[PDB]
Symmetry: C2
């Protein structure tokens, strides 16, 4: 049965170390939709990558420089970013904060 | 061509009035994934509803009482909620704050 629990409580879920200055919690998901909370320290880099999944991100807090398909924009709390299937994208955290990354379908690699 | 722009800047997107004390911005989406930012005043109610879409929500801020399939839980900033296809769910805002609701596939009704 491939899905998260119903209530994903931050203080009950393990933070996974993703890289230097980057930690994440996988929150609500099934095979078609996955929501990930990613906490960045200043200076941390989301390495450029491509994947077939659709991705839609929300900036909860902090300030980030994002690039999507070669285009750069600084985004801040309240802003969103859409990454169509297979587009190159990544980010650098300018001030510590949280992103919510969402995916369709799920990122099987994030649980396996 | 069914999708949002790449960079969804809060100060460039219209807030839509959804109901009493509830406003939303549709952020990054395509036909398979849609991310919605929903700002609630204290007291506001997300009416109980059912839909075939998968939904995964993140509590950005505030405090909410959620019900999913008849089960109630208070959630707060950092917590998530997963709503499998067709489950009855809704919420009441106990302290003003923001939810990110994500859907697969998109909520066609939110743009049409
Ligand atoms: Ca799908
Ligand atoms: Ca990505
Ligand atoms: Ca719903």
């Amino acid at each position: 049965k491939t899905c998260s629990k119903v209530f994903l409580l931050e203080n009950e879920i393990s933070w996974e170390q993703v890289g230097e200055g980057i930690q994440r919690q996988i929150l609500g998901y099934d095979g078609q939709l996955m929501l990930v909370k990613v906490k960045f320290q200043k200076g941390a880099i989301g390495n450029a990558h491509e994947h077939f999944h659709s991705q839609s991100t929300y900036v909860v807090s902090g300030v980030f420089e994002f690039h999507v398909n070669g285009e750069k924009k600084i985004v801040k709390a309240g802003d969103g970013i859409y990454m169509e299937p297979d587009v190159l994208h990544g980010c650098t955290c300018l001030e510590a904060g949280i992103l919510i990354d969402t995916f369709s379908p799920m990122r099987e690699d994030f649980i396996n």
